[PDB]
Design a protein around this ligand. Structure first.
Ligand SMILES: NC(=O)c1ccc[n+]([C@@H]2O[C@H](COP(=O)([O-])OP(=O)(O)OC[C@H]3O[C@@H](n4cnc5c(N)ncnc54)[C@H](O)[C@@H]3O)[C@@H](O)[C@H]2O)c1
Ligand SMILES: NC(=O)c1ccc[n+]([C@@H]2O[C@H](COP(=O)([O-])OP(=O)(O)OC[C@H]3O[C@@H](n4cnc5c(N)ncnc54)[C@H](O)[C@@H]3O)[C@@H](O)[C@H]2O)c1
Ligand SMILES: NC(=O)c1ccc[n+]([C@@H]2O[C@H](COP(=O)([O-])OP(=O)(O)OC[C@H]3O[C@@H](n4cnc5c(N)ncnc54)[C@H](O)[C@@H]3O)[C@@H](O)[C@H]2O)c1
Ligand SMILES: NC(=O)c1ccc[n+]([C@@H]2O[C@H](COP(=O)([O-])OP(=O)(O)OC[C@H]3O[C@@H](n4cnc5c(N)ncnc54)[C@H](O)[C@@H]3O)[C@@H](O)[C@H]2O)c1
Ligand SMILES: Nc1ncnc2c1ncn2[C@@H]1O[C@H](CO)[C@@H](O)[C@H]1O
Ligand SMILES: [Cl-]
Ligand SMILES: [K+]
Ligand SMILES: [K+]
Ligand SMILES: [K+]
Ligand SMILES: [K+]
Lengths: 460, 461, 461, 461
């Protein structure tokens, strides 16, 4: 086996040891492996996969293969690969093209190495994506391959936003499952994953005390809620910015002061609109929005000296790092940790005090500066991915007549019953014991003893 | 000249008025609606039957409805939840209200009937505001001619919405309803944070027990169970959680709670042998939050640690098998809404007996029965939605639609997300919060208007 | 016929007894002493002048002292802290007690005098139990002859100890004293966790304000300040802390609080220009915890955000300049111990004015004034220490010693650490907690006895 | 041509220097001392033997000592705690340092001897800075003539102070010592909040285990156990606490933890039958914090839930019986300082065995072994005390005193509270905190100087 490219194949034994541990941390995913192994529901599936090549993704990949699939894999971020995970996957005879610290050019080449096998397009028939970069490449550059592809399973909020836009414009060519919006994904991974991994990443990058310092978290969706808790539970004084008044209300009730970087919340593009007194007190800013330029150049100029700047949203353009590359000198402290010296572009005093610390060059910091979400959280997300792969592969969209295809071309979530069955394996993994409704109680609230227990409108 | 009311003590009106004036300053969303709509009188002609806890917070709601043009006739929806100074201030303002703390069940029914009837005949009501659905069911079973001229029902709480949806499914719901509970500024504000504030409040007022270091079991982890669990954990309780819904149980685990069942392997086989006696024998406090029936049952009550406190914060008291305790055990009133229940027998007890449980509010929802319910600034969200829902259904004029047009609007719906957001904005400004305004480029990048709504209807917050 | 008492309403006795029976089950350290020493009667012959908040918890203390053989004559140490059902139950037990909630200052002084005098003549007291030093100073200044027959003072609280140490330093202390405050099972239990339980309790009872998301300023971060800040932070307040002690301020920072001063650069030059008006204009709640004077002064009160709540949980009301507010602003009573202070001037208020502050308990310690003080399970520690300190000083019989012997024993001392640990053990067993027993090898390895004491006297916990 | 050092890799120096420059901005009390005393050179002529974790933070300490005039010879006090880039940067600045991460025990001892000897003979040392007492012991046992010229020891940690006080009580301590550990800005900053920061940090780096919703048992609840319990509880762990000291156990209860013992009724009867197997079979993580011996013993390790993590954050690895595991069970290295310990036998294992434990840092203190120890801004307090303590003892010149003068000064003492407050003030200012200044009237009222000290020496904070 040579159909791979990783940083260091000799890291495979280490990766395998950590994969074995992760298996014990992922009962929902391992439960799927044991339940479906005999049936081989993914036999004949050929899955193009593009998502962070971590230990957790390793268990996902080996589950898909255990259920019958062939895959070709790449990471979806230049800094998120764990080289020991990539090595163990390569060592198991699975094509993987990923390493921590890719250039942008190498990132694209890796995705292309999955799309092409031995110089020609692979006969792929399934896609697993995180954020939609592979989805867009297939649509823009390889539309003929989409004729043979039965579906896409998309991991994350930004990827879903891009899928819905294509569907709205009539450009989506195969159906998709929104894996993000399973409750055992969005309200587990997006929130509690970041609760675990944001302070983890900041500590590994800087080793800064967080207790007693001032943080500003931009956004209070699922990622912003978990990120704010990551910081507050360490004793940070956290302020929260939001454009959505409902999410701002939740931030208030959770005990956070809600503030804007701009006077009266109005960004008129001028420096005069920056709340300089507020930003001058902030030791740490974290962007969580999935939006663009929410930590802009004027905010970066006004931040307190030596503030830490990081992003845990999907794409690095939440922060105007381009402005910083154009105007300020970058000092590498260590990989994925840069001091950005606001004193000039072409040099800096080694003992300068007017700098910012940028983590992961603005790429998602939990994966770039630590290891991302822990296995027992990714268990929920990735159990959903496997169910979504099984569901779309069994439907065989690519083999339907044109009229049948029109009826199935959608972006759907998994049924609530499967959401509950994933959650139950997660609960048992903690040693939790769910109560069984009596027949009288089940009649009283109008559900089956087996579930589902909530209407589809329920928000948890 | 006004006598069309019944309250505990009208002399409490001045105190109630003082507390209403304070609550106005804590309810910016509700008082914003009062300012915004007073000139146009959107509820002119509305005659609202209202049945919800006669608190200070409900008083501000009532006076907002009246300020916008409505007439009302009011009762409380629970026998223990009225604040007598609130009822007195409302009656003193010339508003028909029939409510006092400590009603009997017969007086509860009479009070609702006093709103329905005026001078012994059906009132010309045309709107209904309800909490839990008791008023709604009485109208459907006993006063169907009155429903002909009623334009809608606005329903406050999870249990009432369940009852409305069941009537709609069976085709017996006679007028459209707005599910006020499922505004995010209700369900994810009131149901959760209100119980966070008021559960430990009620337990302290009823018992003055230290909670730190003691063991609690919360039955349920929906919105009320989540807020209830935090109310106790933030005081230092060691909180375990029970759930039938594995997704909610997953949230409890991630939130740092041990998830347990009262029954071995979660299976209630009906016998004492299925009870986890070791677990229940360690619990100092059990709180029911489910909206379900008999989730703190006789066999659990028998197994609880001596001197444990038992209470319910769900809508109805049958969450706990209090009937079993009335039939079998000796009740000793400590003070109003606090009883020691002696497990040594039915007829009499030794005053120094150590084998008792403490029941709060006779199993009725404890935050309203033993304290004052949710605080004004939280009820601001729920009741701003109520006012918006009353305006919405009243303007639609369902009773005046022809039969074929009624058929297209007979539903149970929530308010538009834009209104939910506008309520939350006023709440946020009440805290001094400053929301950020999207730039045009950012609004285009995420595909929303700068004015909102900011999330798709599928968003769960 | 027993008549040697004055309480608000003797008919509350039965309610008080019911709550005393409950509190006994919540105070295992105190009731452990009652059971261990009953046969020995170590306080036979003791005649105790007691002056401390006449609560249910103090009731259990009083009845413990009596059960161990003492006679007592009791008053409350604060005009607002008595629980009338507790005072009635004690009076109904034939115990002289002079206390009711809502005393005037003259009535407060008169009550202390009714304990000192029996049938118009000085009682033959030989022991003192005090909270804050008022009774101690009256005896020293007004009844010095009574001190010749007194064997010692046991003092509950930080402020009272400060006053005792000053008298010892100046040679005016006439009898030995035990500093009960500085047992760890007092200072690091009662002062901290008691306020944690009872500060947000009192604020909710007085105002029913939502605390979540609002801004608080706690003045001081000693034991009371630490517990008060946690009481508010755990409810979701955004808490800032002020301190003059940099070590305490360091703890506040590490605990996750912003440390700020009401004054620019922390310097109070007496002028309004030194007030940080922007800071105070955002504060919704200020709580004074210092035992110091005028830490919430007139210029701070002028600068506070409209409708801020103002309260004190330190020992005396002069932490807040309420004299300035009485002289310059108009007071509107909302209900007992809750006043709106209208900053619009003297000489009349508009009932709908928005420019007021809310003052709780007229500046007196708010946990006892607007709620019920610390819960029984916390006061268990403080009051087991009191019982042990009374036994200790009474057995020493200072008043009977020759002058050279008295000279050597005239001091202000804390109880031995071994007793402190023995109180804590009973508290821990009350929670079901299980301490581990050191093996002899482990005890040898750290240089302690298996029995304890486990820490050197320098240890700070 | 500087060669008087031994480190892992000198080419890591530039990276170490970058992190030192950052750490200087995180250590304002230490850099304040540098600026205050540089001109005075108070440590001119000082020659310090240093033995403490060769971290970035120790690097800032070393460079402060040198900047005040000292020469040093340095080693790490633990085989796994050195940060190799820190050591390289110190060596690159021309400072003798003998330290690398992953020393053998033999190399550990050789490194200490390289500080003691220079070119084969005793260095002309005259000061000692130590953590845990290994260097102090070696000097007393093997180099008594060197102690003749040494003016003092400054000891960092609880375990080292315990060893100093035993030598003092036995007459074998040869030079005076400063207990740096018991400054409040050390013990109640470093010991507590340092572990709060770095314990969950080390566990995440070693295992990347989710902690939320899992079960932990923290052995001990002193300063380290308090900070460790919070480290885990704040992550959502369900934390149980063990203690032999009932006062610390009481604090754990009040802080909201269940207090349990690994042994039934807390009593070890010398057999497996006294292990609470039901309790330990539920524990996912056990952390020892005691400074005691064998508090996680062989029978406890046999009973732990499969796949539980085992670690120690006390000073020495013998808190856990790792010797039993080396003798009986098969060790599989996951990665450096992370081992799976297969309870299925000593001779080999199945790679997919489920019956293993995970041991971090081979039982050596886990925050330093699997992460980077405490953060700079916390070590600021500890190491500012170290500098002040070195200055104080060096200026006293004990070695030069006549025998009868030595006798009056041979002691183990803490720094004065005034210095403790001055360190804290610089820490507070580092956070942007603003302490209030007492007015003259307020200072008189509480009996302190406006400058401080603000508390009596008995105060426990
Ligand atoms: N790093 C991780 O492991 C991880 C985990 C989950 C999701 N994600 C990514 O994180 C991002 C956020 O995901 P989510 O699920 O929380 O989305 P979300 O829609 O739930 O929340 C994003 C929030 O940002 C707010 N926002 C938008 N523009 C803003 C602005 N200018 N100022 C302030 N707030 C603003 C929105 O109002 C919204 O509430 C997405 O890109 C998603 O793909 C990352
Ligand atoms: N007292 C208050 O102020 C207040 C506030 C809001 C709602 N309510 C009432 O509280 C109740 C709960 O409301 P909600 O909005 O949280 O509803 P919800 O549907 O969100 O949550 C109820 C939860 O109970 C769980 N449950 C049901 N049967 C169970 C059983 N046998 N054991 C364990 N868990 C079980 C369900 O899985 C569900 O998650 C309703 O009756 C509602 O009307 C009261
Ligand atoms: N209400 C209760 O139940 C209760 C309980 C215990 C004690 N007390 C009383 O509370 C008070 C405080 O007791 P404690 O044990 O916490 O005392 P403490 O000495 O531990 O703490 C008081 C703190 O106030 C700080 N302080 C003093 N002046 C200040 C100022 N101008 N600005 C800011 N901070 C200032 C001091 O630095 C000190 O840290 C005393 O009067 C005590 O008798 C009341
Ligand atoms: N790793 C770090 O960074 C770090 C930081 C500070 C101190 N330390 C070390 O940590 C250890 C603890 O220090 P500390 O300051 O917390 O000491 P401490 O005296 O404050 O606390 C130790 C506690 O352990 C308890 N204990 C003793 N034997 C026990 C047993 N068998 N079971 C349960 N509890 C038991 C004692 O009662 C005591 O409360 C010392 O070895 C110290 O040198 C390490
Ligand atoms: N980063 C660090 N650098 C140096 N010493 C440390 C660090 N973290 C913890 N310590 C110290 O290690 C000692 C235990 O050996 C504790 O007393 C503590 O002060
Ligand atoms: Cl032994
Ligand atoms: K991970
Ligand atoms: K209320
Ligand atoms: K009480
Ligand atoms: K560090």
């Amino acid at each position: 086996f040579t159909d791979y490219k990783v940083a260091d194949i000799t890291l495979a034994a280490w990766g395998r040891r950590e994969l074995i541990i992760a298996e014990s941390e992922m009962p929902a995913l391992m439960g799927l492996r044991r339940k479906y192994a005999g049936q081989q529901p993914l036999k004949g599936a050929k899955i193009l996969g593009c998502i962070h090549m971590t230990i957790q993704t390793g268990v996902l990949i080996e589950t898909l293969v255990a259920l019958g699939a062939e895959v070709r894999w790449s990471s979806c971020n230049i800094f998120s690969t764990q080289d020991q995970a990539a090595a163990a996957i390569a060592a198991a005879g699975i094509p993987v093209f990923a390493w921590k610290g890719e250039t942008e050019e190498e990132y694209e080449w890796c995705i292309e190495q999955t799309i092409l096998k031995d110089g020609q397009p692979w006969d792929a028939n399934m896609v697993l994506d995180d954020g939609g970069d592979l989805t867009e490449i297939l649509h823009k550059k390889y539309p003929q391959m989409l004729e043979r592809i039965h579906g896409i399973t998309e991991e994350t909020t930004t990827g879903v936003h891009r899928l819905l836009d294509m569907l709205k414009n009539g450009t989506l060519k195969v159906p998709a499952i929104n894996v993000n919006d399973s409750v055992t994904k969005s309200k587990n991974d997006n929130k509690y994953g970041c609760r675990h991994s944001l302070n983890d990443a900041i500590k590994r990058g800087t080793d800064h005390l967080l207790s007693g310092k001032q943080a500003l978290v931009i956004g209070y969706g699922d990622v912003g809620k978990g990120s704010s808790q990551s910081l507050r539970q360490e004793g940070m004084i956290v302020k929260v910015a939001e454009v959505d008044p409902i999410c701002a209300m939740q931030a208030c009730m959770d005990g956070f002061e809600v503030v804007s970087p701009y006077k009266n919340g109005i960004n008129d593009g001028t420096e005069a609109s920056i709340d300089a007194a507020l930003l001058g007190k902030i030791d740490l800013i974290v962007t969580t929005t999935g939006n663009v330029n929410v930590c802009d150049a004027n905010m970066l100029k006004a931040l307190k000296k030596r503030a830490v700047v990081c992003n845990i949203g999907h794409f690095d353009n939440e922060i105007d790092t381009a402005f910083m590359r154009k105007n300020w000198a970058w000092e590498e402290v260590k990989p994925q940790v840069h001091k950005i010296h606001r004193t000039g572009k072409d040099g800096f005093d080694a003992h300068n005090d007017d700098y910012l610390i940028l983590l992961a060059e603005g790429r998602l910091v939990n994966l770039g500066n630590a290891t991302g979400h822990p296995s027992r959280i990714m268990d929920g997300s990735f159990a959903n991915q496997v169910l979504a792969q099984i569901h779309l592969f069994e439907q065989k969209y690519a083999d339907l007549p044109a009229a049948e295809k029109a009826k199935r071309l959608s972006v759907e979530v998994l049924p609530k019953k499967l959401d509950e069955e994933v959650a139950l394996e997660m609960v048992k993994g903690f040693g939790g014991v769910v109560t069984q409704l009596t027949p009288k109680q089940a009649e009283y609230i109008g559900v089956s003893v087996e579930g589902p227990f909530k209407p589809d409108t329920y928000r948890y």
